[PDB]
Amino acid sequence: RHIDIQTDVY
Amino acid sequence: KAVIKNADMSEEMQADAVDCATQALEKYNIEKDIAAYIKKEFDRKHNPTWHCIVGRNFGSYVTHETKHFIYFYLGQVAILLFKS
Amino acid sequence: KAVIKNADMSEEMQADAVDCATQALEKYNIEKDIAAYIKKEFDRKHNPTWHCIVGRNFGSYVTHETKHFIYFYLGQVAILLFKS
């Protein structure tokens, strides 16, 4: 239940 | 359009998310209103609690609900949703 | 520049968050690891549902139990830390 995400530097 | 990266729910709790986000993006012009609309619609659709994050320059460790997680894009906007 | 936009907490909790966020942002360059470390540290300290988020185009309005939110602007980055 512990997650990491970021995506698509702009 | 229909672009999904990491979906942890079933097909309907992903497709409904895509549809509601699509209608939100087509209705509002405000990211804050997008977040509030997702929360309201999913709260009155599935279950009392629903938590979403909308933007394009963000990202963070977050404790979602096990089996409950979705992340996708609409044009350029990263939209994430989960249960608490 | 330590600027606080919105909050609902106690002063001690807000100051603890300010100092911890300051050290994390000064240490880690990437917003992802900054938020990861902050959220893990406040998981270790306080409620195991603390959500730390970071960015420059970030917005999220989620259903919540009150008294544990802060949304501030330090330097040229927006940092949120809240609990639901």
Close Cβ partners of B46 (under 8 Å, ≥ 6 residues apart): B13
Give the other-Cβ count within 10 Å of C42's Cβ.
Answer: 23
8-state DSSP, B58: B
In chain A, what is the greatest distance between 2 CA atoms, to the nearest angstrom? 28
| H or E element, residue C40 | helix C31-45
| Chain-chain contact of A4 with C32 (C-beta, under 8 angstroms) | yes
Count of A-C CB contacts under 8 Å:
4
Structure tokens at C29: 């360059």
C-beta separation of B79 from B21 below 8 A: yes
C36 touches A: beta carbon within 8 Å: yes
B55/B77 Cα distance (integer angstroms): 6
Nearest to B70 by CA among B27, B2, B10: B10
CA distances (Å), origin C69, targets B15, B34, B72, C7, C22: 31, 20, 26, 5, 17
Sign of CA dihedral C23, C59, B65, B18: negative
d(CA C8, CA B13): 32
